[PDB]
């Protein structure tokens, strides 16, 4: 079916419609229905799901739960074009696909289609969870570069968030933590980019596997403290102290993967995507006809 | 050898849903992704919600800057239409309608139109305003179109802001979006690549005759082709049982798949592999030549 | 369940993980053995990997338990005969 976005997803799960889910999982639903004792012969179960009564949707949510599926975009070129997700059921008729994963599939949303495949046997469910799961493919096999790099909206939300301007609301005030930085942004007393001394507590792990806390006052902005609320423990503050374009957020996720491993990098990739979408929505970053500024010197050059 | 032909015409009414394809007239495609409620829409300081929220980031890379000029000129057209609706809903006499429609039809440089309403005789002007109240249509020929200053002067005739950008509030939080955003009217088309014509699913359907594999297509209730590059992409992982059931149990081997169906409806979750029957077809086609292919041991 | 990283930290091959967890899930599903960790109505695959993460199951312990519970069956048969 045709794909669509659904940005509420965690990156190990994808949205899958109820009609496709009841068609692809007919034998598991038959086995579940025969186990409970609701029906007797197989025919009765096929009439039940042909009618789609009120009790087979609970059966369907109990066959989905921990059963991965293989999503596949139709021109598969490398191995990151078949990835295994966990379904989340969708009122609708379109596969909801987590956005970061799109940069692996070369999948935009201009009319694309993807195929779902079901691992039937038990070794195949374990291969989908342990080799082909989308959390397991965060580095491209051609090199060392991360393939779950945040693509387009989220880097605009970050670049508007962690930046600065020479005067805003709350210029040069002092803040006792990142929590009241977000509280000053939400209440309407400061701006998202307004330079400010905060007190942040960065955890540097300089010992042999022991995280040592160092707390200090960084001359930073409001947005850099709000984005510091999402960074895991081990990374230093200077990973967010700059302006965070796309190369900088890619090496942010890369340094998180090299230091803190896989699980903080998966949960931190999701928190990056969520905060990028949220502050890009709050940014209101349009495009106008006045934004393309003609040089005044252009006509004399011609 | 046919007795009678009965033809029946069903008439479906397909509305809209997440998954259809809409597009403007400049290449801005898109799968509609969420059909929001009315309240969540960004509204402005008049009260009206916006209908569709596009994405700005498609403009500087995909260089179709014409859609933003079309958006601003559409907002100018609807501003003139709203002023006609205001001057007509208050039951005003035809003199003020004649004044305003004449000012909205002159408005430019040396142009081709040059109309005058002094030869419409007080009844056509009311019916012309009955047709203009949902907006005023504007022609813009291809390479001799409306420049920027004419769009600005027409946005000044309505009481809209000059830059085309209204500040917009939020529907969820109820608090203002910073840095005022671009609204207007774009003329968007629904394309007939719908989503309840592409969506398909198959547990177990019919099987082909010469090679015991599932049929192809949607009208024939068929399964999706697990092609060659996907086989390469599963060799590229270490997924070995997934590929074995992906090309022996789920696809070809008939005794294997009936054993599989009994094992799935009994909770077992186990495959008895066997051989693809299409490999036996390969043996019969190579063997039907003078070639003697076998299976040793 | 999201990641299987520690299940590879305790079985370093990442392919032997699939064999050990498949053997364990086949013992729990059809053979009717109790899980050694209390579940939360998870499926048998996640309970297998959840036993791998505790460390109380790998291929060594599975061979030990299959040899001892095969010797127990044959010992019960021999003491029933003689």
């Amino acid at each position: 079916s045709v794909i669509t976005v659904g940005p509420y997803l965690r990156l190990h799960q994808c949205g899958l419609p109820k009609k496709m889910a009841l068609e692809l999982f007919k034998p598991f639903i038959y086995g579940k229905l025969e186990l409970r004792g609701l029906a007797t012969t197989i025919k009765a179960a096929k009439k039940m799901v042909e009618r789609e009564e009120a009790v087979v949707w609970d059966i369907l949510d109990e066959v989905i739960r921990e059963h991965p599926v293989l999503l596949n975009r139709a021109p598969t070129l490398h191995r990151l074009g078949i990835q295994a997700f966990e379904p989340v059921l969708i009122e609708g008729k379109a596969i909801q696909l987590h956005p970061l994963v799109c940069a692996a599939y070369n999948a935009d949303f201009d009319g694309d289609q993807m195929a779902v495949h079901v691992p039937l046997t038990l070794e195949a469910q374990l291969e989908a969870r342990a080799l082909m799961m989308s959390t397991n493919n965060i580095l491209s096999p051609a090199n060392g570069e991360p393939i779950i790099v945040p693509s387009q909206d989220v880097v605009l939300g970050l670049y508007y968030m962690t930046r600065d301007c020479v005067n805003a609301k709350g210029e040069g005030m002092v803040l006792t933590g990142p929590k009241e930085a977000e509280r000053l942004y939400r209440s309407g007393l400061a701006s998202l980019h307004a330079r400010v001394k905060v007190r942040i507590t960065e955890y540097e792990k300089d010992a042999n596997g022991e995280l040592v806390a160092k707390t200090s006052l960084k001359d930073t902005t409001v947005g850099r403290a709000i984005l510091w609320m999402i960074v895991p423990k081990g990374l230093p503050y200077s990973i967010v102290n700059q302006a965070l374009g796309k190369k900088a957020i890619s090496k942010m996720l890369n340094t998180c993967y090299r230091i803190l491993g896989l699980k903080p990098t998966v949960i931190f990739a999701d928190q990056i995507m969520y905060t990028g979408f949220a502050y890009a929505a709050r940014s209101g970053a349009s495009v106008g006809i006045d934004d393309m500024v003609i040089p005044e010197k252009k006509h004399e050059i011609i | 050898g046919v007795l009678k032909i009965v033809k029946v015409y069903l008439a479906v009414k397909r509305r809209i849903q997440p998954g259809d394809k809409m597009a403007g007239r400049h290449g801005n495609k898109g799968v509609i992704s969420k059909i929001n409620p009315i309240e969540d829409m960004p509204y402005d300081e008049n009260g009206t919600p916006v209908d569709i929220v596009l994405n700005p980031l498609g403009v500087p890379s995909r260089m179709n800057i014409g859609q933003i000029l079309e958006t601003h000129l559409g907002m100018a057209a609807k501003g003139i239409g709203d002023k006609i609706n205001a001057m007509l809903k208050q039951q005003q006499e035809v003199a003020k309608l004649r004044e305003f429609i004449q000012r909205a039809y002159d408005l430019g440089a040396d142009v081709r139109q040059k109309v005058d309403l002094s030869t419409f005789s007080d009844e056509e002007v009311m019916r012309l305003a009955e047709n203009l109240r949902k907006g005023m249509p504007i022609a813009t020929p291809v390479f001799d179109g409306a420049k920027e200053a004419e769009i600005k002067e027409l946005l000044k005739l309505g009481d809209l802001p000059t830059s085309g950008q209204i500040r917009l509030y939020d529907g969820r939080t109820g608090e203002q979006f910073e840095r005022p955003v671009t609204v207007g009217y774009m003329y968007m088309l629904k394309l007939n690549h719908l989503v309840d014509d592409k969506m398909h699913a198959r547990s177990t359907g019919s099987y082909s005759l010469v090679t015991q594999q599932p049929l192809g297509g949607k009208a024939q209730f068929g399964g999706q082709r697990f092609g060659e590059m996907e086989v390469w992409a599963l060799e590229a992982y270490g997924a070995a049982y997934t590929l074995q059931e992906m090309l022996t149990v789920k696809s070809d081997d008939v005794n294997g798949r009936t054993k599989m169906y009994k094992n799935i409806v009994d909770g077992n979750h186990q495959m008895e592999p066997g051989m693809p029957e299409s490999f036996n077809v390969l043996l019969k086609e190579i063997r039907s030549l003078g070639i003697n292919i076998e299976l040793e041991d | 369940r999201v990641t299987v990283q520690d299940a590879v930290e305790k079985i370093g091959n990442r392919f032997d993980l699939v064999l050990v967890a498949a053997r364990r899930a086949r013992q729990m599903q059809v053979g009717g053995k109790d899980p050694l960790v209390p579940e939360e109505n998870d499926k048998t695959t996640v309970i297998a990997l959840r036993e791998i993460e505790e460390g109380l199951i790998n291929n060594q312990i599975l061979d030990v338990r299959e040899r001892q519970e095969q010797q127990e069956q044959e010992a019960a048969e021999l003491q029933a005969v003689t």
């Binding site: 070794e123 291969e127 | 060799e235 992982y237 270490g238 070995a240 049982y241 074995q244 | 392919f15 064999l19």
Partner: peptide
Amino acid sequence: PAGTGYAYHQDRMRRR
């Protein structure tokens, strides 16, 4: 004989 099946092919190549 590469992925998960390399143990199976080790077993089959050992048992000849």
